C-alpha cells in the first residue's frame, strides 16, 4: 500500500458539523452477472442510490454537512435551485423537513419534452408530497445561481435568514460528503481484501467527483478516478471540478495543492444535452434491470453506465481488473420519463 | 437459531436501520415511535418482500427452478420485487396481474410498479379480472410451463408462504438484537398485514424467543376475524417448519381492521392524513396503499388513548412507495 494513508481524510473531517440524514455506510456489491455479460473486467456498485433519503441518492450525503452548516449558521429557510426533474431538489426537501425547516426552490425548464409526466410526475410529484414551496420555473438559461441570491436578498429583507445551497448541492461544504464516501469506500475495500483499479460515475454540477479526488488525494491512494459527464464538454467539467475540488481540498486543511492530472473526465456520452438519453442510455438502464435488478436513471447514472459499458467493450481494461461504478441514485426521476419509455 | 438450516440468498441490505421519529412523537404528544426501516431493504426501491424472497428464492433454486411464477393486483410491490429478485439469479418471472383496483387512469394502469415491472423484463402474462381464483391461475400456467420443459417455481401472493414467512421469523430476531444494542424497551410493535406473511412470520418469531413484545396487524382489506384466522394458520405452518415444540399461542395474534376503508387499494382520508404528516415531518414516503393504512391506523390509536406517553412503539415500514406514482391522479385530485 506504499505511503496510502487511510483516515487522513477522516481525521480533516472530523472537526466540522454533520448531520444523520442518511444509512451509511452503503453497501459495496459485486454485479457478476453483468461483469460476465460484457466480458471483461469485474464491476463492483458503490450503492449511494441506497442512502434513506426519500428513494435516495448522492445528495443526500452533500446534504448531511450542507444541513449542519445551515443549523449552525441559524438559518431558518433553505433555497435551493434544479431542474423540473431534479433529484436534488426532493432530497433536500425531504432533509430539511426533518429538521422542520421549509425548503424554497425554484425550478428551470431545462426540458420540455417528455410531456405531461415529466412536469408532475417523479421528482415533481414527490416535492410536492414532501411539501417543498417551489416558487418559480425559470426559462432554460437562467442564471439559477443569480435567481436564488436576488429571492435570498427578498428574504432577509421580511426577516428571514436563508441558506442558499447551490444547484446539486455543490459547494465546498457540500463536497465533503464524498470526501467521506472516499474513506468509506478505501475502509470497505480494505475488509473484502478488494484492489480497486478505476472508480467510475457520473459527473455535473462536480460535487461528487471534486470530494471522490480530495478524499483519494489525500489519503494517497492510487485509485485513477473517471468522471462520465452528463452536459459539459470535458475541458470545461474538468477545469470545475479541479476548481471545486481545491476550495474543498483548502476548506479541510490539507497543506499543498491537488494534482491537477488526478481530474479526469470522459464527455462523450452527453448525447444531445442535458437530461436527454441516448440509445446507449437507454440499452444501460435496461442492462442493469434485467441482469442485476438495479434502477439506473435516464439523466445521471444511466448514462455514468452507457460510459462504463461502452469503455469496458472498447476493450479499455483488463478482465483481471476491478472497477467501482458508484451508483449516485435517480430512480425517481423514472417516473418523469414514463411517456418516453413507452415510445 | 432454528433459522440457520434453511437456505437463504442475500437479495437486500440487511439489517435495516432502527431509528426514532422525534419529530412525529413531538407531534402527537403521547408515545415515542420508532421506525423499523424495511422501505430500506434496497431491492428496486425497497420493500418487506424482499426478506420473504431471500428465502423462498433460494429454496427454488435448491429445487432446481428455471422459471418463477407469481402473482399481484395491477400496482403489487411483491411482483416488482420478485422479478428484479429474480433477474439477480439470472432468472425470468412470468406474472399474472389481478385488476384489484379500476380507478385512477392511466397512471395506476402504466406507471408505478408497473413501469418498474416492464423496465425490470417480467413477463406479464395477462391482466385477470377481480375475484379470480389467482392462485389456480398459476398452477394452470406452471403445468402448461412443465409440458413445455420447464420447472416453474410458483410463489404465492405476496409471498406468504411458510417458506417466505422465514424472512419475517428472521426480522423478528434482527428487531431484538437491535433493542437489545440500543437499550430500547419495546412496548408494542404495529404494521400493515395483508397477505399475512409478515405477520406470520413475526409472530412465530417473537413467540419462539418467548419475547412478550405485543404485535398488532393493521389490516389492509380482510375484516378482523378472517385476518386473524389466516395469518394465525400460517404462523402455526411456520412454526411447524421450524419444528419448534408444541403450539402458537392464539392471544399471540391481532389484527384491526378499522382502517381498512372502502376496500383494498382504496386511501382513506387518514391513510392521506398520515402520508402527509410522514412525508413532512419525517422525510418519510408512505404508500397509499399499504403502509399509509397502518400509520393511519397507529395515528387513530394514539389519539384514542390506546398508549401511554412512556411507552415505545415500533411501526415497521413495509414499503410500497413506487406505488405512489401510480396514484398521482389521486393526488392531484
Redesign the interface.
Known amino acids: 500500500t506504499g505511503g496510502q494513508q487511510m483516515g487522513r481524510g477522516s481525521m480533516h473531517l472530523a472537526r466540522f458539523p454533520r448531520l444523520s440524514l442518511g444509512?451509511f455506510p452503503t453497501?459495496l456489491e459485486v454485479l457478476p452477472?453483468l461483469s460476465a455479460y460484457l466480458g471483461g473486467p469485474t464491476i463492483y456498485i458503490k450503492?449511494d442510490d441506497?442512502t434513506?433519503?426519500?428513494?435516495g441518492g448522492n445528495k443526500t450525503r452533500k446534504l448531511e454537512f450542507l444541513l449542519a452548516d445551515a443549523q449552525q449558521q441559524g438559518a431558518d429557510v433553505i433555497i435551493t435551485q434544479g431542474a423540473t426533474q431534479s433529484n436534488h431538489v426532493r432530497q433536500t426537501?425531504?432533509?430539511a423537513?426533518?429538521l422542520?425547516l421549509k425548503t424554497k426552490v425554484l425550478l428551470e425548464k431545462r426540458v420540455e419534452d417528455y410531456g405531461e409526466?415529466y412536469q408532475?410526475?417523479?421528482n415533481v410529484?414527490?416535492d410536492?408530497?414532501?411539501?417543498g414551496d417551489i416558487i418559480d420555473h425559470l426559462p432554460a438559461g437562467t442564471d439559477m445561481q443569480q435567481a436564488m441570491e436576488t429571492l435570498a436578498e427578498s428574504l432577509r429583507k421580511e426577516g428571514f435568514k436563508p441558506y442558499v445551497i447551490p444547484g446539486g448541492g455543490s459547494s465546498p461544504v457540500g463536497a465533503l460528503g464524498y470526501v467521506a464516501c472516499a474513506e468509506e469506500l478505501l475502509f470497505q475495500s480494505s475488509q473484502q481484501r478488494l484492489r480497486i483499479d478505476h472508480i467510475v460515475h457520473a459527473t455535473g454540477s462536480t460535487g461528487t467527483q471534486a470530494g471522490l479526488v480530495t478524499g483519494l488525494a489525500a489519503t494517497h491512494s492510487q485509485i485513477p478516478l473517471l468522471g462520465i459527464s452528463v452536459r459539459a464538454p470535458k475541458a470545461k467539467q474538468e477545469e470545475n471540478v479541479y476548481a471545486l475540488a481545491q476550495r474543498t481540498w483548502q476548506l479541510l486543511g490539507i497543506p499543498g495543492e491537488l494534482p491537477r492530472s488526478a481530474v479526469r473526465v470522459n464527455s462523450d456520452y452527453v448525447g444531445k444535452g442535458y437530461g436527454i438519453p441516448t440509445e446507449g442510455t437507454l440499452e444501460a438502464?435496461?442492462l442493469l434491470?434485467?441482469?442485476?435488478?438495479?434502477?439506473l436513471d435516464p439523466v445521471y447514472s444511466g448514462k455514468g453506465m452507457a460510459g462504463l459499458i461502452d469503455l469496458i467493450r472498447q476493450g479499455h481494461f483488463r478482465a483481471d481488473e476491478n472497477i467501482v461504478f458508484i451508483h449516485t441514485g435517480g430512480?425517481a426521476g423514472?417516473?418523469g420519463y414514463?411517456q418516453l419509455?413507452?415510445q
Not at 434513506?52 to 428513494?55: K, V
Open positions: 444509512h453497501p452477472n450503492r441506497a434513506g433519503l426519500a428513494t426537501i425531504a432533509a423537513a426533518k422542520g409526466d408532475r410526475s417523479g410529484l414527490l410536492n408530497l414532501l411539501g438502464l435496461r434491470a434485467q441482469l442485476e435488478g438495479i434502477l430512480s423514472l417516473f414514463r419509455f413507452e
